[PDB]
Amino acid sequence: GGRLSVDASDIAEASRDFGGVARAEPMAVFHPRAAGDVAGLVGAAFRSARGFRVSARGHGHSISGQAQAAGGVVVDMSARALPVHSAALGGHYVDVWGGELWVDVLNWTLSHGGLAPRSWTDYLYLSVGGTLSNAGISGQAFHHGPQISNVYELDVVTGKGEVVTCSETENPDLFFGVLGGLGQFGIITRARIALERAPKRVRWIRALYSNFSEFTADQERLISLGRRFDYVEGFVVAAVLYCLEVTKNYDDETAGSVDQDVDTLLGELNFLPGTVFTTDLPYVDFLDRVHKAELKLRAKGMWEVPHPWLNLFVPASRIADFDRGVFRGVLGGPVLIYPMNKHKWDPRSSAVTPDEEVFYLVAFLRSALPGAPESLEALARQNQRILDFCAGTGIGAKQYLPGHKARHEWAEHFGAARWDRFARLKAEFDPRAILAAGQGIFRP
Ligand SMILES: *Cc1cc2c(cc1C)nc1c(=O)[nH]c(=O)nc-1n2C[C@H](O)[C@H](O)[C@H](O)COP(=O)(O)OP(=O)(O)OC[C@H]1O[C@@H](n2cnc3c(N)ncnc32)[C@H](O)[C@@H]1O
Numbered sequence: 137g138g139r140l141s142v143d144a145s146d147i148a149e150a151s152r153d154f155g156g157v158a159r160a161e162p163m164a165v166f167h168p169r170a171a172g173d174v175a176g177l178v179g180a181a182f183r184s185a186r187g188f189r190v191s192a193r194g195h196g197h198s199i200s201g202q203a204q205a206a207g208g209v210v211v212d213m214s215a216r217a218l219p220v221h222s223a224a225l226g227g228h229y230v231d232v233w234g235g236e237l238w239v240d241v242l243n244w245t246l247s248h249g250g251l252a253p254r255s256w257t258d259y260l261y262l263s264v265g266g267t268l269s270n271a272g273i274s275g276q277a278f279h280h281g282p283q284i285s286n287v288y289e290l291d292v293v294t295g296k297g298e299v300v301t302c303s304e305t306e307n308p309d310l311f312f313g314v315l316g317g318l319g320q321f322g323i324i325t326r327a328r329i330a331l332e333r334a335p336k337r338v339r340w341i342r343a344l345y346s347n348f349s350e351f352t353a354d355q356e357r358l359i360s361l362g363r364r365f366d367y368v369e370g371f372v373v374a375a376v377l378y379c380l381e382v383t384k385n386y387d388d389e390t391a392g393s394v395d396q397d398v399d400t401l402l403g404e405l406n407f408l409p410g411t412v413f414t415t416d417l418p419y420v421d422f423l424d425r426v427h428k429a430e431l432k433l434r435a436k437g438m439w440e441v442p443h444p445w446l447n448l449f450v451p452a453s454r455i456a457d458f459d460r461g462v463f464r465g466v467l468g469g470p471v472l473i474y475p476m477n478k479h480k481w482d483p484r485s486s487a488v489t490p491d492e493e494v495f496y497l498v499a500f501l502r503s504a505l506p507g508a509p510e511s512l513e514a515l516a517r518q519n520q521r522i523l524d525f526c527a528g529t530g531i532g533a534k535q536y537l538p539g540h541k542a543r544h545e546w547a548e549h550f551g552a553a554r555w556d557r558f559a560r561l562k563a564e565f566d567p568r569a570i571l572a573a574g575q576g577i578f579r580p
């Protein structure tokens with residue numbers, strides 16, 4: 137028994153996202169109690185004369201209306217199952233509601249056996265369904281793969297309102313389709329997340345580089361290890377400097393070897409001498425670092441501003457050219473940069489990566505000036521110049537969280553083989569194009 141809402145506040149929240157640009161309004165907001173309610177609503181849309189749009193909304197972190205259902209219904213997804221041990225899988229898992237926020241997943245698993253997911257996002261106030269519809273990447277991805285490589289099973293409400301249990305061994309086409317599938321094939325109501333025994337503490341390290349060749353070579357060396365770091369990221373610093381960000385996870389057993397492990401790993405690096413900054417803190421506090429920054433930004437009215445964010449996966453063979461052309465060139469806010477290992481990404485998923493073993497996430501996490509539309513416009517022009525640069529020099533970059541829209545652009549994004557598979561999955565699972573229409577891939 138779900139609740140359909142026309143409360144102006146619910147409609148307003150469902151008509152906006154973190155991007156702060158796209159504002160397509162639904163007719164109503166649906167508040168489900170369980171998966172059956174979501175099935176009932178989607179089934180009704182599938183059976184309706186006009187076939188109204190239905191989109192699941194997580195924490196509303198989309199940049200360009202990906203969770204918006206124009207003139208349709210937005211499903212507001214955001215007792216709990218205890219983590220379970222499996223002798224067959226050789227480890228723990230936990231069943232979570234599709235709308236559960238990663239921060240709540242973490243608190244639950246830690247309080248029920250000191251367990252935690254292996255692969256994260258930088259920000260824990262994201263839904264499980266939301267990140268599993270993209271990839272879910274952070275400093276752990278190089279080793280454990282993205283969050284889509286750390287899920288055993290799903291319950292999916294298809295575009296026909298059918299509840300399907302899927303995994304690698306049961307309805308694999310739907311399971312792999314949904315993973316990185318941009319909400320196109322169904323709403324995730326359950327996700328079975330892989331867990332490891334959680335470390336208690338983190339040795340959080342930052343070091344500076346003026347030489348991009350040295351910075352990238354050290355990042356690429358670090359991701360090839362396994363003695364290694366548990367987290368590998370980086371960011372562009374305005375003086376242009378490059379910051380290497382690494383962590384070493386530890387507990388009561390490994391506390392006696394953490395100092396030597398860190399010193400041995402750092403001694404092999406080429407960072408600028410005297411630029412090593414170190415922090416020692418609990419695991420939860422490190423993982424929740426972005427939420428701490430959010431509370432400060434909200435206090436200064438600098439959180440609820442437009443975010444014209446651009447995320448690219450750049451092949452490592454083209455990272456050098458990307459730099460003097462972009463970081464020195466086009467740019468002259470936070471710019472993330474770190475490499476990942478493609479072998480940790482299952483090629484059966486809908487996720488789109490460059491055709492190279494090592495590729496970088498290059499994240500332009502820009503904030504427009506509050507109440508200043510011209511700031512958003514200038515930042516959007518900068519984003520287009522970055523795409524023009526990639527196109528003009530033939531960098532085979534792929535957009536992460538793509539905001540494309542044109543049919544030939546989606547064809548180019550996926551490539552022929554992946555596009556054909558994606559279209560066949562849509563015909564099978566959402567033939568009326570009811571689901572996640574805000575992604576702008578298909579029409580009824
Ligand atoms: C705002 C933000 C985003 C973010 C981040 C930090 C911030 C402050 N850090 C990230 C990181 O380190 N790594 C990464 O992989 N992504 C990061 N992000 C981006 C984020 O993952 C995406 O914005 C993603 O969409 C998750 O956000 P959210 O949970 O808010 O979900 P949504 O934006 O409402 O909807 C996204 C799309 O998925 C569909 N959807 C939503 N829930 C479901 C379920 N349960 N099942 C199926 N599809 C679902 C929406 O309809 C939409 O198309």
Ligand SMILES: O=C(Nc1ccccc1)Nc1ccnc(Cl)c1
Pocket residue numbers: 258259273426429447470472497499501536537
């Ligand atoms: O947004 C992030 N990562 C991200 C976002 C979208 C796609 C991929 C990565 N990371 C992050 C780190 C520090 N502060 C803030 Cl506000 C955000």
